């Protein structure tokens, strides 16, 4: 019964997820793995279904890690879905500062893919700005992809002076 739950969470079937989660006996099926190690929290957050991820957080789910170290917030920022992002950030504030195997945060992905409202949503909250494994900030990673709107809304923000300070003086690429 694992793969029907993975399908119904990956494609936003809320009533099928309610009928599968009617029995609250075994929670190991709720936080089960995958071939790629994604629990249905990651599946519901990857495709951007806010009501499904809200139901899985109401029934109790753990912010586990991908084999690439990602979280549900990493997938919601990779897709740029602000609704699932707002649902995740209203539950636990300790999910924001989270690193993958490459050392990227969710703000790095949201700035890399050019989603302005996702960057503004993580930026209105405390985003814990940090460098990459290659000592790149999210602003560097936004500038290397010529994403005009996200660096414009970083300029229009209030935390511009904090973003301007941090960079490595030793990297030839990330100046």
């Amino acid at each position: 019964k694992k793969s029907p739950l993975h399908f119904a969470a990956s494609y936003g079937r809320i009533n099928t997820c309610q009928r599968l989660l009617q029995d609250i006996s075994d929670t190991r099926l709720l936080n089960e793995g995958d071939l790629h190690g994604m629990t249905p929290l990651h599946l519901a957050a990857k495709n951007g279904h806010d009501k499904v991820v809200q139901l899985l957080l109401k029934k109790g789910a753990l912010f586990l890690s991908d084999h690439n170290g990602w979280t549900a917030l990493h997938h919601a920022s990779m897709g740029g879905y602000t609704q699932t992002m707002k649902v995740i950030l209203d539950t636990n504030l300790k999910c924001t500062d989270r690193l993958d195997e490459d050392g990227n945060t969710a703000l790095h992905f949201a700035a890399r893919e050019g989603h302005a409202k996702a960057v503004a949503l993580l930026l209105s909250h405390n985003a814990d700005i940090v460098l990459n494994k290659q000592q790149a900030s999210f602003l560097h990673l936004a500038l290397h992809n010529k994403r005009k709107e996200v660096v414009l809304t970083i300029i229009r923000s209030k935390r511009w002076d904090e973003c301007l300070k941090i960079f490595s003086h030793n990297s030839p690429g990330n100046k």
Binding site: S3, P4, Y11, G12, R13, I14, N47, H49
Partner: peptide, 16 residues
């Protein structure tokens, strides 16, 4: 709209 189609579609005899 297509994501809404997949969200509201009825699946019998194609499950699992």
């Amino acid at each position: 709209l297509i994501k809404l189609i997949i969200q509201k579609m009825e699946i019998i005899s194609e499950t699992e």
